[PDB]
Amino acid sequence: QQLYTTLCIEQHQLNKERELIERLEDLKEQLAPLEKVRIEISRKAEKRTTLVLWGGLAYMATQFGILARLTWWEYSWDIMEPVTYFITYGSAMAMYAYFVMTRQEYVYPEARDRQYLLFFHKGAKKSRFDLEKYNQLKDAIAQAEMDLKRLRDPLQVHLPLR
Amino acid sequence: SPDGVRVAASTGIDLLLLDDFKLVINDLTYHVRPPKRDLLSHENAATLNDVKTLVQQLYTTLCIEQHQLNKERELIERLEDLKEQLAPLEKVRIEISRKAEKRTTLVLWGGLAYMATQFGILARLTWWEYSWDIMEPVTYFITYGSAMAMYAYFVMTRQEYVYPEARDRQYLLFFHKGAKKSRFDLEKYNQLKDAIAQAEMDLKRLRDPLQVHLPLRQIG
Amino acid sequence: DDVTVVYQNGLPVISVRLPSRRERCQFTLKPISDSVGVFLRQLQEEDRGIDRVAIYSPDGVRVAASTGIDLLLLDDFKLVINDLTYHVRPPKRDLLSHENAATLNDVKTLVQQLYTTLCIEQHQLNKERELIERLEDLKEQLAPLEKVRIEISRKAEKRTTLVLWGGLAYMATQFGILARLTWWEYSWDIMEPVTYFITYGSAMAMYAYFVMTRQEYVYPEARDRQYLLFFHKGAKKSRFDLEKYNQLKDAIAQAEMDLKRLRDPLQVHLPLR
Amino acid sequence: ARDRQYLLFFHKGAKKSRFDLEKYNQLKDAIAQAEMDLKRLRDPLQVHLPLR
Amino acid sequence: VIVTRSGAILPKPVKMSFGLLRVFSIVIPFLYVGTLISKNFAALLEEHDIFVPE
Amino acid sequence: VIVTRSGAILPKPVKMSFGLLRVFSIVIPFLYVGTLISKNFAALLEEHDIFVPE
Ligand SMILES: CCCCCCCCCCCCCCCCCC(=O)OC[C@H](COP(=O)([O-])OCC(O)COP(=O)([O-])OC[C@@H](COC(=O)CCCCCCCCCCCCCCCCC)OC(=O)CCCCCCCCCCCCCCCCC)OC(=O)CCCCCCCCCCCCCCCCC
Ligand SMILES: CCCCCCCCCCCCCCCCCC(=O)OC[C@H](COP(=O)([O-])OCC(O)COP(=O)([O-])OC[C@@H](COC(=O)CCCCCCCCCCCCCCCCC)OC(=O)CCCCCCCCCCCCCCCCC)OC(=O)CCCCCCCCCCCCCCCCC
Ligand SMILES: CCCCCCCCCCCCCCCCC[C@@H](O)O[C@H](CO[C@H](O)CCCCCCCCCCCCCCC)COP(=O)(O)OCC[N+](C)(C)C
Ligand SMILES: CCCCCCCCCCCCCCCCC[C@@H](O)O[C@H](CO[C@H](O)CCCCCCCCCCCCCCC)COP(=O)(O)OCC[N+](C)(C)C
Ligand SMILES: CCCCCCCCCCCCCCCCC[C@@H](O)O[C@H](CO[C@H](O)CCCCCCCCCCCCCCC)COP(=O)(O)OCC[N+](C)(C)C
Ligand SMILES: [Ca+2]
Ligand SMILES: [Ca+2]
Numbered sequence: 132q133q134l135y136t137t138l139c140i141e142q143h144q145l146n147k148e149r150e151l152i153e154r155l156e157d158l159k160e161q162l163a164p165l166e167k168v169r170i171e172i173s174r175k176a177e178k179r180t181t182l183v184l185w186g187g188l189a190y191m192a193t194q195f196g197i198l199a200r201l202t203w204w205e206y207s208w209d210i211m212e213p214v215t216y217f218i219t220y221g222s223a224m225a226m227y228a229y230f231v232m233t234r235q236e237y238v239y240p241e242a243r244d245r246q247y248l249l250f251f252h253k254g255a256k257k258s259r260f261d262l263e264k265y266n267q268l269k270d271a272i273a274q275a276e277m278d279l280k281r282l283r284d285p286l287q288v289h290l291p292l293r
Numbered sequence: 294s295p296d297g298v299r300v301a302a303s304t305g306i307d308l309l310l311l312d313d314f315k316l317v318i319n320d321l322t323y324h325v326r327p328p329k330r331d332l333l334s335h336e337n338a339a340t341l342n343d344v345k346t347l348v349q350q351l352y353t354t355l356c357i358e359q360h361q362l363n364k365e366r367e368l369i370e371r372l373e374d375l376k377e378q379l380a381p382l383e384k385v386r387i388e389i390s391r392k393a394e395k396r397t398t399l400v401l402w403g404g405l406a407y408m409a410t411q412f413g414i415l416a417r418l419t420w421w422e423y424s425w426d427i428m429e430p431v432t433y434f435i436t437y438g439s440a441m442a443m444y445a446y447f448v449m450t451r452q453e454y455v456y457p458e459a460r461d462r463q464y465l466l467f468f469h470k471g472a473k474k475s476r477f478d479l480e481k482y483n484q485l486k487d488a489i490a491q492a493e494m495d496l497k498r499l500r501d502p503l504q505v506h507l508p509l510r511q512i513g
Numbered sequence: 514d515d516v517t518v519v520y521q522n523g524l525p526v527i528s529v530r531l532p533s534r535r536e537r538c539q540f541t542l543k544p545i546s547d548s549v550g551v552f553l554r555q556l557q558e559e560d561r562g563i564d565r566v567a568i569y570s571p572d573g574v575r576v577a578a579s580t581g582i583d584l585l586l587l588d589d590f591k592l593v594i595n596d597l598t599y600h601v602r603p604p605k606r607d608l609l610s611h612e613n614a615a616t617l618n619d620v621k622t623l624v625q626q627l628y629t630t631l632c633i634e635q636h637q638l639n640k641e642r643e644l645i646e647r648l649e650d651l652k653e654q655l656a657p658l659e660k661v662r663i664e665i666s667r668k669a670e671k672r673t674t675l676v677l678w679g680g681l682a683y684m685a686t687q688f689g690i691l692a693r694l695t696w697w698e699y700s701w702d703i704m705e706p707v708t709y710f711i712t713y714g715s716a717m718a719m720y721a722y723f724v725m726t727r728q729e730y731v732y733p734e735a736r737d738r739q740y741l742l743f744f745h746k747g748a749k750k751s752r753f754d755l756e757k758y759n760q761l762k763d764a765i766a767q768a769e770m771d772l773k774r775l776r777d778p779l780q781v782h783l784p785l786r
Numbered sequence: 787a788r789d790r791q792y793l794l795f796f797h798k799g800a801k802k803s804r805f806d807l808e809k810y811n812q813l814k815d816a817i818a819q820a821e822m823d824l825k826r827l828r829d830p831l832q833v834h835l836p837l838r
Numbered sequence: 839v840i841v842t843r844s845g846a847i848l849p850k851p852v853k854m855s856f857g858l859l860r861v862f863s864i865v866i867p868f869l870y871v872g873t874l875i876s877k878n879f880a881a882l883l884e885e886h887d888i889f890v891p892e
Numbered sequence: 893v894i895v896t897r898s899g900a901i902l903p904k905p906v907k908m909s910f911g912l913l914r915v916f917s918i919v920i921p922f923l924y925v926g927t928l929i930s931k932n933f934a935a936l937l938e939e940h941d942i943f944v945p946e
Binding site: 789 | 839851
């Protein structure tokens with residue numbers, strides 16, 4: 132305790148947390164130019180993902196209309212029933228070719244996320260975005276915040292309570 | 294500040310003694326001159342930092358077991374205060390999650406009632422009035438319309454149509470209007486419910502250095 | 514009689530039968546933030562047919578009105594109402610606060626931690642010096658095995674690729690067979706039940722897959738299962754011991770995990786975990 | 787559904803045999819806790835044990 | 839799964855009391871009123887000379 | 893799941909503004925053109941004496 136006073140250790144600990152706070156709020160200084168570009172790219176990628184979602188819905192409605200006109204107006208059901216079976220089996224073939232080609236199963240909220248990532252990574256290369264520096268900053272901020280949260284832990288005595 | 298402007302209240306002390314300043318007491322103005330702390334050695338100071346961080350680790354172990362008993366009893370006192378502050382809101386919360394579950398079992402039983410009456414419609418109209426050759430494309434387009442509505446559910450909710458996730462979504466939409474009609478604040482209940490879990494997670498993080506005398510684990 | 518209290522999610526309640534009203538009045542209590550005098554103040558607020566109320570000890574001495582109820586509810590006690598003495602025996606607990614007087618074990622663990630923090634840096638650096646040599650030794654011991662495991666995991670991949678494309682070719686030839694039968698040779702009035710029973714046979718085979726393999730038939734899991742079967746049957750016809758390779762890779766990962774778990778406390782001077 | 791049918795068979799057999807399941811569950815958690823804090827005492831990094 | 843991360847056993851899954859009679863007492867009369875709705879609708883459509891099966 | 897790791901209730905599910913009208917305004921005018929396409933294709937194939945059923 133006579134070394135904790137003559138070496139001025141409390142100001143050394145508060146200097147340490149001031150250095151941590153300054154490093155954290157200076158890592159957030161060179162991030163704010165990048166998120167203004169990233170929000171733009173993500174917005175104009177989701178605006179293209181909703182286009183293919185509504186286009187798939189419009190395609191299913193168009194196929195309903197095509198198969199509904201012929202079975203009652205022009206032809207009979209005895210002509211259009213094998214066509215509408217083989218359309219179903221062709222859809223079951225296409226959903227398997229999606230698995231062979233894409234190495235993942237065809238479900239809706241994963242195909243949407245994969246298509247969104249492909250749109251984003253096309254747009255980030257089109258706009259010459261610096262993605263790796265963005266990922267490095269987003270990792271370093273999440274590490275510095277965890278280090279600051281571990282420094283001011285209330286169950287330890289790392290900093291005085293004043 | 295020595296050019297005449299005033300220094301604000303919450304200005305740090307380390308910023309203050311860079312240049313001069315003037316201290317004004319009731320009638321007197323003293324002109325303070327802080328010295329220059331030019332003892333900034335780069336060498337012979339990476340060996341002062343290790344001794345200064347060793348003295349902190351030596352002081353910490355001298356004052357850590359009497360600290361984690363004061364924090365333990367303060368956590369127990371805050372836990373038994375937060376429980377009594379939460380306990381009036383709990384009986385109001387249960388009676389909103391009882392109407393919101395009865396309105397969800399009405400949907401879950403009326404889906405079964407809709408499927409059973411569609412079965413009874415098609416089974417009446419296939420064997421009795423019209424033939425199966427007349428009433429086959431109706432069933433096929435019923436099936437394709439269901440396969441289209443299950444995709445429109447995904448296009449509108451960004452969530453795949455399975456049974457228990459749609460049940461939980463409909464339950465939460467019932468609850469967040471039951472808790473709005475009856476004048477119930479969910480924000481105070483959520484901040485009274487996360488503070489209890491936060492205060493009792495730290496109570497079991499104190500099991501290591503107080504029960505078995507092992508060093509406790511960090512946040513995360 | 515109130516022979517006992519009731520525990521409710523960590524809080525006590527005394528069911529004290531009041532003197533001038535023939536009822537078992539419940540009384541919930543905060544054990545840490547209340548004293549005995551508070552409980553006697555709020556016990557007599559109910560009826561005021563109380564000319565004497567006093568909490569005693571089992572030995573018979575009076576208990577002060579300022580002791581906390583958590584210190585009272587450690588042992589059993591007596592509650593004297595103005596004519597009858599209700600003996601109270603609360604249920605026994607284990608611990609709430611790990612607090613008591615000093616012990617020789619406390620000072621013997623204090624000099625243990627004071628001995629730890631003087632030599633933990635010169636022991637952790639002498640352990641990191643061992644780890645940075647052990648990791649490069651393990652990573653150069655493994656160099657013959659990765660050259661063989663890549664040649665096994667490329668044969669298993671080039672066989673499961675043919676299994677995938679062969680399944681696609683089978684479900685594309687079934688289309689051709691059925692679409693030749695329903696339009697050229699025979700008609701749909703013949704080939705509709707064969708279509709239905711092929712669909713039902715596929716739905717039966719997808720359940721028999723679950724009965725045999727004890728897992729559901731989805732595509733990226735039935736691919737990986739057959740890949741692992743090709744790998745383990747191919748690594749047995751090449752004399753490749755996986756029990757060495759697996760323990761080398763997990764030992765390398767454990768050494769790297771311990772290195773990254775100690776090296777950052779050397780940077781930021783925090784505890785390890 | 788297979789695991790749910792397995793649990794409904796096991797919890798009927800455990801009531802027929804009077805198996806005292808909760809002492810089994812608390813022992814199985816307690817030995818995992820005693821192995822966890824024993825393994826955190828034989829740490830190669832923390833110098834908790836001498837002659838090592 | 840059937841066990842926890844230790845070797846303990848997961849508890850007994852909850853059972854809806856009298857489940858099959860609660861399902862079959864709401865499946866059957868709605869099936870019957872489905873047949874009634876379809877019979878009366880077909881009789882109405884035939885009686886007004888719109889769709890007569892011939 | 894309807895709660896967090898605490899007892900705190902999950903937030904409100906994000907509904908889409910006019911979701912049913914946005915679906916029924918994209919289903920119906922595409923079902924109509926899907927009718928018109930098939931009608932014109934059937935008439936164009938019938939007129940050139942390729943596929944006539946009756
Ligand atoms: C008295 C009664 C007694 C009778 C008893 C007699 C019964 C016969 C005994 C036969 C036993 C012999 C054993 C043979 C060993 C074979 C091993 C082998 O092949 O080595 C592979 C070997 C790997 O060996 P391995 O390491 O042990 O791994 C194998 C498994 O992984 C193993 O482990 P796993 O964990 O992965 O297990 C998965 C397993 C299990 O998963 C399954 O898929 C189980 C399937 C069983 C379901 C049964 C469905 C019931 C159908 C209804 C019945 C219809 C009758 C109708 C009658 C109507 C009359 C009223 O899959 C397989 O192992 C089988 C592979 C594919 C089989 C598909 C056959 C099913 C269709 C049969 C129906 C026949 C229709 C005839 C119609 C004719 C019309 C004129 O190398 C490989 O190349 C990998 C295989 C690549 C993928 C599959 C390739 C398919 C090959 C043949 C298919 C031909 C074309 C498909 C035609 C489709 C039919 C329409
Ligand atoms: C005008 C010209 C022509 C008209 C054309 C068609 C018009 C039909 C109108 C249909 C619209 C439905 C109206 C509902 C709107 C309001 C819903 C609402 O407030 O509900 C409150 C309630 C809670 O409200 P909330 O808390 O504010 O939450 C709002 C949303 O739930 C929040 O939901 P979310 O954000 O979580 O996402 C859910 C989302 C998910 O979105 C969807 O699921 C949309 C699905 C539809 C997509 C399009 C399908 C494509 C169909 C193809 C069309 C083919 C046409 C045929 C032509 C072919 C020939 C060319 O939306 C919904 O589920 C909305 C609920 C409505 C369900 C719609 C189902 C109707 C299907 C009809 C299709 C066409 C009919 C064919 C007619 C055939 C002719 C013979 O919502 C519910 O979900 C409850 C469901 C209850 C539904 C009705 C209950 C009836 C019960 C009657 C009493 C039974 C008595 C028993 C008697 C006992 C006897 C023994
Ligand atoms: C870019 C500019 C805008 C373009 C606008 C035009 C858009 C054109 C339409 C493109 C379609 C893409 C969306 C696909 C919607 C088809 C919906 C599909 O489900 O219909 C099935 C009919 O199948 C279709 O004919 C094709 C099957 C899909 C195979 C092709 C995959 C195309 C994916 C391309 C990536 C786009 C992301 C997908 C968005 C969801 C019938 O449903 P069902 O039988 O009951 O499936 C069972 C449900 N499962 C899958 C969850 C088990
Ligand atoms: C104010 C309170 C109101 C109370 C009274 C309300 C009474 C409402 C009556 C209607 C009940 C709602 C119906 C919900 C259940 C519909 C039955 C449906 O689920 O059955 C399907 C039949 O489908 C229907 O024909 C089309 C309905 C499509 C659903 C659109 C969403 C509408 C519900 C929105 C609210 C969500 C409630 C979820 C309840 C489960 C099964 O077909 P299948 O193909 O073999 O299953 C495929 C397996 N999947 C689902 C895992 C993929
Ligand atoms: C020496 C090298 C070896 C060469 C061997 C070459 C062998 C070539 C032939 C291989 C045949 C493999 C068949 C692959 C499966 C065919 C595609 C399958 O999906 O068709 C289904 C119909 O086929 C039947 O189900 C049979 C499948 C039963 C299992 C067959 C044995 C599989 C053993 C091999 C497993 C690895 C296969 C690779 C992943 C497909 C369609 O089902 P559908 O209704 O439309 O959609 C259901 C979607 N689900 C599954 C997600 C629900
Ligand atoms: Ca059919
Ligand atoms: Ca027919």
